[PDB]
Amino acid sequence: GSPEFMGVTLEGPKDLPPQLESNQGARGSGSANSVGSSTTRPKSPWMPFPTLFAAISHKVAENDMLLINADYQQLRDKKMTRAEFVRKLRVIVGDDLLRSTITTLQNQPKSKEIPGSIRDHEEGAGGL
Numbered sequence: 770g771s772p773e774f775m776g777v778t779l780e781g782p783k784d785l786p787p788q789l790e791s792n793q794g795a796r797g798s799g800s801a802n803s804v805g806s807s808t809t810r811p812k813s814p815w816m817p818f819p820t821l822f823a824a825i826s827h828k829v830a831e832n833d834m835l836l837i838n839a840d841y842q843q844l845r846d847k848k849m850t851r852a853e854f855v856r857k858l859r860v861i862v863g864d865d866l867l868r869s870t871i872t873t874l875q876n877q878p879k880s881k882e883i884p885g886s887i888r889d890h891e892e893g894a895g896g897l
Contacts, residue, residue, distance in 0.1 A: 825862060
């Protein structure tokens, strides 16, 4: 019997976790680049485009080279520049393939005959 009631105390948690955190190490990833190749053309060797199309006909598809002949003809009509038809050619055929045809264009046969103008050769003698 006869209580006194010891009242509510006011402590709490205080031995809390360590608060430190990392930002250690490094990070990064990427790649970007651009490359090409070019050479001048001497006058002596022989590589006209209308013959070049007949030398790749074994290496192209018939409706794919039908397009090339059309894109080359509208270059001649000044609808397009030479370099712009070449930029839409090297996506169809390829400039490595172009290079590999040059040696065959240098293998090609030719002739430029004339019909026989002179046939006389008999004896020039006189005073017989």
